[PDB]
Scaffold this active site. Structure first.
Site, mmCIF file in Angstrom:
data_model
loop_
_atom_site.group_PDB
_atom_site.id
_atom_site.type_symbol
_atom_site.label_atom_id
_atom_site.label_comp_id
_atom_site.label_asym_id
_atom_site.label_seq_id
_atom_site.Cartn_x
_atom_site.Cartn_y
_atom_site.Cartn_z
ATOM 1 N N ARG A 366 8.672 2.913 -0.960
ATOM 2 C CA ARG A 366 7.303 3.332 -0.671
ATOM 3 C C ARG A 366 7.282 4.685 0.026
ATOM 4 O O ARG A 366 6.505 5.573 -0.339
ATOM 5 C CB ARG A 366 6.609 2.277 0.190
ATOM 6 C CG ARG A 366 5.091 2.343 0.169
ATOM 7 C CD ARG A 366 4.533 2.605 1.558
ATOM 8 N NE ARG A 366 4.886 1.541 2.491
ATOM 9 C CZ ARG A 366 4.028 0.661 2.986
ATOM 10 N NH1 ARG A 366 2.746 0.685 2.657
ATOM 11 N NH2 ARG A 366 4.465 -0.267 3.832
ATOM 12 N N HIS A 371 5.301 10.340 -0.934
ATOM 13 C CA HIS A 371 5.350 11.783 -0.743
ATOM 14 C C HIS A 371 5.532 12.446 -2.103
ATOM 15 O O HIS A 371 6.550 12.233 -2.772
ATOM 16 C CB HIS A 371 6.485 12.156 0.208
ATOM 17 C CG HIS A 371 6.946 13.573 0.079
ATOM 18 N ND1 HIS A 371 8.271 13.910 -0.100
ATOM 19 C CD2 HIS A 371 6.262 14.741 0.106
ATOM 20 C CE1 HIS A 371 8.382 15.223 -0.179
ATOM 21 N NE2 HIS A 371 7.177 15.752 -0.058
ATOM 22 N N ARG A 828 -8.371 0.793 5.155
ATOM 23 C CA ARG A 828 -7.104 0.871 4.434
ATOM 24 C C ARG A 828 -6.127 -0.180 4.940
ATOM 25 O O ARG A 828 -5.485 -0.877 4.147
ATOM 26 C CB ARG A 828 -6.479 2.258 4.590
ATOM 27 C CG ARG A 828 -5.849 2.815 3.321
ATOM 28 C CD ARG A 828 -5.831 4.338 3.311
ATOM 29 N NE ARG A 828 -6.984 4.944 3.966
ATOM 30 C CZ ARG A 828 -8.180 5.075 3.410
ATOM 31 N NH1 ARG A 828 -8.421 4.653 2.180
ATOM 32 N NH2 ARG A 828 -9.158 5.653 4.102
#
Length: 928
Positions: A366, A371, A828
RNA sequence: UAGCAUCCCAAUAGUGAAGGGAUCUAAAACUUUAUCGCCGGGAUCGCAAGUCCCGGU
């Protein structure tokens, strides 16, 4: 009419937007030439001219006459009814009366019939002006506009956003734009009452009245642009069937608000695009191919982010039920969940190592893929580090993880045999007769689906094959009567061969793919595609094919026919046609050789912590990205990844095979199952060997246990009941569906029975009986529980992908801000980590979707997609939901008339509920 | 907005910007218990879901 995706000089034309300029080019070559396409679109512009001069009813005589008069090569009554003018020629130094040339085609046609060079000049002038306008539109369609008027205004608004000065001063620009007069004229015209045409005419009148002010400043130019977009959205000139467009849409207040919202959405889209360009380091050179590669990389990354978010959710459900760190661990619950997942039991001393190796398998991937950059995929996928008061470092090759991975590797033969027996093709086909499919010299059993980016499913391929057989010379696909358990076995074996035997080598091999493509292309004579060479890889060739498809549905039919022909050829050649004739009635040798070292275990565990559907989605996106790639080392790494996904798919449906000893005890099983009985359907004959339902064990494995318990706690007389039990014994479902097939064939022979009241009532009664029996079966065997879990997990994954988009834009904007409300972040933390299944926050699915709209309100492209996602998911699951107007529900979308999507039988009065009305009630209660 | 969303470009401002583009945006299409006729055309809805004729089993 349409300047791109058209076949000019037998090749597709498309626009490539460079950082400067931006041009029209052909299908493949990068040579920037708009002039050739502009000159070659002359016939298309002639068609546009005739469609403009002729009204919506294009009657043949007038169309032919206009085309013949307009085109020398094409040369071969009331006029205003079929008609749809004062103009200035292009070579006009100034606009006045003396260059104001006439166009009155009605009089021209009347005069000609009484017996059109001026009309030809009008057509030529319009064609030339439209060529120049389209040419300039293409030429100025730069990626990040700087010298354009709209681009410059957007850049100034970006500067104000980066500073703390509020841009687009909206009340002032409205007042000095004469929005008051505009709205007064629009309201008067709407009251007077083709009302959209009149409103647009008044809009243009106001434009002409204030053009001396709006032609010099970008702020008024863009204000008029968004006003025009508002007019087209609510009172469309072209989209006649949109809606009424009530007077409320004309209010000064909310037209002000919508103009401001459109401007802010454009500004934020521009800033996120700039952040994307800065993060991908392509700001200097942005091409269409570069942006397409960035889009493919983005989509694959988002699918992988959803997959690893599901893995993190599963790890959370395994270790820490409430989260958003390791001290609070339920030992027994973790042991049970790990056993259910991995089909094996670990000791108490191994629980910390298991949990932390799970974290080291999920989290680093992840972190590496969230990125956005060009990262080494081999170093991304190898991940041989497991992190341990103090932090240590061990290897997955020295843990129980290696043992479990190797056990799955060795039991993949046993797993495929067990699945084949569960779907019971063993009971129909002999051992040695069956063994001759995995023993093909080159088509060895490989768990990789295929490197084809768009891999047709067996359902689609078999349905289309039956349709084409009943000239593709098809002889494999037959007997689509799913009532027969012989067909059930044949279909299961065909699916297994298709998925784990055929595509592996038919995709890693080019010859069979080329043969199938050639046969499909040359059968009908899909003209706009080319046959490959012997050295062309089928993966990259058909990735180009699907690229053409998703620019442009002939391509889907073409791909389905290609895979159909390939499957037929393979079955015919390898002497595998015996599967088509099941005959109900040793061990089967299963070859399985795969190149797995101890470096694939991390992805193995991450895959094992996913559902079959999410694993298939991840595999499909991974295949697409692998095809889009160009490096063989990365190709091999993604090939191993696909092999791991196949491993997970084969061992995903292991489930449990235990009696009441699986749970705590008999009373615990009764408590946990009666919430969703001692007789045959749930327990065996002895009354002390209760079969653990696949629905219950799966819903406990995937963490939906608490949510589905809360849902089924609605009322007590709502689960399995005496009436549901008795509906099984009312009639035989096999006989009912056979009668339905016979009646369908009768209406096939004679459609007139659709008008016979008695026959249509009988067919409707049979359909209702079939639907009721299927719902009762899904109730006794709890398939409704499984389907509900699939619904909620699909919704959670949809919001997880939406929040992956949100995080991508968040980090892009943050990067651009660095180069130059925490409620959404808490949201989130609530949604992306699947905290609904945790249940602490206690927000329903509609509340979650409203939250997603709230956070994704930064752009309307996602604010609208958030609302449409629930509708589309439920429609694909067999049920239509009509959202109530948001302004009447305080922006929190509710459900109105959540109804079964009526699969239409025979526009007629007969319709089958794809999902039961009781299931619709189930979904309504779950959503609310 | 609920089907046509979103964003980019486009100045003879009635040649209507009533224009073009989007693997360049996002849905979605694809994606491992199946109760919908299929293929091959024509016509027409802004096209889209779909509609009407026309044909073979």
């Amino acid at each position: 009419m349409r300047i791109t995706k058209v076949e000019v000089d037998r090749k597709k034309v498309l626009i490539s937007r460079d950082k400067n300029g931006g041009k029209l080019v052909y299908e493949n070559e990068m040579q920037d030439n708009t002039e050739q396409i502009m000159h070659h679109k002359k016939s298309s512009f002639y068609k546009s001219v005739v469609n403009k001069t002729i009204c919506r009813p294009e009657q043949k005589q007038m169309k032919k006459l206009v085309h013949g008069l307009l085109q020398e090569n094409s040369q071969e009554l009331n006029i205003s009814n079929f008609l749809n003018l004062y103009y200035f020629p292009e070579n006009s130094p100034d606009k006045s009366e003396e260059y104001r040339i006439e166009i009155n085609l009605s009089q021209l046609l009347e005069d000609s019939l009484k017996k059109m060079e001026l009309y030809i000049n009008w057509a030529e002038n319009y064609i030339s002006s439209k060529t120049k306008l389209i040419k300039k539109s293409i030429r100025n369609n730069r990626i990040q506009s700087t010298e354009s008027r709209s681009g410059q205004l957007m850049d100034r608004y970006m500067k104000d956003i980066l500073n703390k000065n509020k841009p687009f001063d909206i009340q002032s620009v409205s007042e000095k734009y004469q929005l008051e007069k505009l709205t007064s004229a629009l309201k008067a015209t709407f009251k007077e009452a083709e009302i959209n045409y009149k409103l647009k005419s008044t809009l243009q009148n106001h434009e002409r009245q204030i053009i001396e002010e709006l032609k010099e400043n970008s702020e008024l130019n863009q204000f008029n642009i968004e006003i025009r977009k508002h007019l087209e959205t609510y009172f469309p000139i072209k989209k006649t069937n949109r809606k009424v467009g009530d007077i409320r849409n004309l209010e000064i207040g909310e037209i002000q608000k919508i103009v401001n919202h459109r401007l802010k959405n454009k500004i934020v889209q521009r800033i996120l695009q700039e952040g994307k360009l800065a993060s991908y380091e392509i700001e200097s050179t942005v091409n269409s191919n570069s942006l397409q590669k960035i889009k493919i990389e983005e989509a694959f990354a988002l699918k992988f982010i959803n997959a690893c978010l599901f893995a993190s959710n599963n790890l959370r459900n395994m270790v820490y039920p409430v989260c958003k760190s390791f001290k609070e661990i339920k030992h027994k619950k973790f042991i049970r969940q790990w056993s259910q997942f991995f089909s094996q039991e670990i000791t108490v001393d191994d629980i910390e190592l298991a949990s932390w190796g799970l974290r080291g398998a999920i989290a680093p991937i992840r972190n590496e893929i969230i990125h956005l950059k060009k990262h080494s995929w081999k170093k991304f996928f190898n991940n041989p580090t497991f992190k341990v008061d103090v932090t240590s470092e061990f290897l997955y090759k020295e843990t129980l993880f290696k043992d479990y991975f190797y056990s799955e590797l060795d039991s993949v033969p046993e797993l495929i045999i067990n699945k084949m027996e569960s779907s019971k093709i063993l009971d129909y086909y002999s051992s040695d007769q069956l063994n001759q499919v995995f023993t093909i010299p080159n088509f060895e059993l490989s768990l990789l689906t295929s490197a084809v980016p768009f891999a047709p499913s067996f359902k689609r391929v078999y349905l289309k094959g039956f349709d084409y057989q009943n000239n593709l010379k098809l002889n494999i696909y037959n007997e689509k009567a799913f009532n027969s358990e012989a067909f059930q076995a044949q279909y299961s074996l065909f699916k297994m061969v298709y998925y784990q035997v055929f595509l592996p080598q038919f995709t890693t091999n080019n010859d069979l793919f080329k043969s199938s493509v050639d046969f499909i292309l040359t059968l009908n004579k899909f003209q706009d595609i080319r046959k490959m060479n012997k050295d062309e890889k089928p993966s990259e060739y058909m990735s180009y094919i699907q690229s053409q498809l998703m620019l442009y549905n002939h391509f889907e039919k073409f791909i389905n026919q290609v895979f159909i022909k390939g499957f037929n050829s393979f079955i015919e050649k390898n002497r595998l046609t015996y599967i088509c004739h099941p005959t109900k009635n040793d061990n089967i040798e299963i070859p399985f050789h795969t190149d797995m070292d101890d470096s694939n275990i991390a992805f193995w565990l991450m895959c094992k912590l996913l559902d079959a559907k999410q694993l298939s989605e991840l595999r499909n996106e991974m295949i697409k990205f692998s095809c889009s790639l160009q490096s063989t080392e990365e190709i091999s790494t993604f090939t191993k990844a696909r092999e791991v996904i196949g491993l997970a798919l084969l061992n995903g449906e292991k489930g449990c095979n235990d009696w009441k000893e699986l749970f705590d005890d008999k009373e615990a099983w009764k408590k946990n199952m009666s919430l969703y009985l001692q007789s045959l359907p749930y327990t065996q004959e002895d009354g002390q060997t209760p079969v653990i339902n696949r629905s219950i064990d799966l819903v406990k494995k995937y963490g939906t246990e608490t949510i589905l318990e809360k849902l089924f706690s609605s009322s007590d007389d709502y689960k399995v009941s005496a009436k549901d039990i008795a509906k099984l014994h009312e009639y035989d479902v096999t006989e009912k569906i056979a009668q339905q097939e016979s009646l369908h064939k009768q209406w096939i022979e004679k459609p007139g029975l659709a008008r016979d009241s008695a026959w249509t009532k009988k067919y409707q009664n049979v359909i209702n009986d079939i639907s009721n029996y299927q719902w009762a079966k899904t109730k006794v065997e709890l398939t409704q529980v499984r389907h509900l879990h699939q619904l909620t997990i699909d919704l959670l994954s949809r919001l997880a992908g939406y929040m992956s988009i949100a995080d991508r834009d968040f980090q892009f904007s943050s990067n651009y801000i660095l180069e130059r409300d925490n409620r959404l972040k808490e949201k989130r933390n609530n949604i992306s980590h699947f905290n609904y299944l945790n249940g602490q926050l206690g927000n329903s699915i509609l509340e979650l979707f409203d939250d997603a709209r709230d956070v994704l309100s930064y752009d309307r492209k996602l604010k609208n997609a958030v609302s449409k996602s629930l509708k589309e998911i439920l429609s694909s699951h067999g049920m239509e939901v009509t959202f109530k107007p948001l302004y009447q529900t305080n922006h929190h979308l509710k459900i109105d008339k959540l109804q079964p999507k009526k699969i239409h039988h025979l526009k007629s009065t007969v319709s089958s509920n794809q999902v039961s009305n009781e299931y619709c009630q189930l979904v309504r209660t779950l959503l609310t």
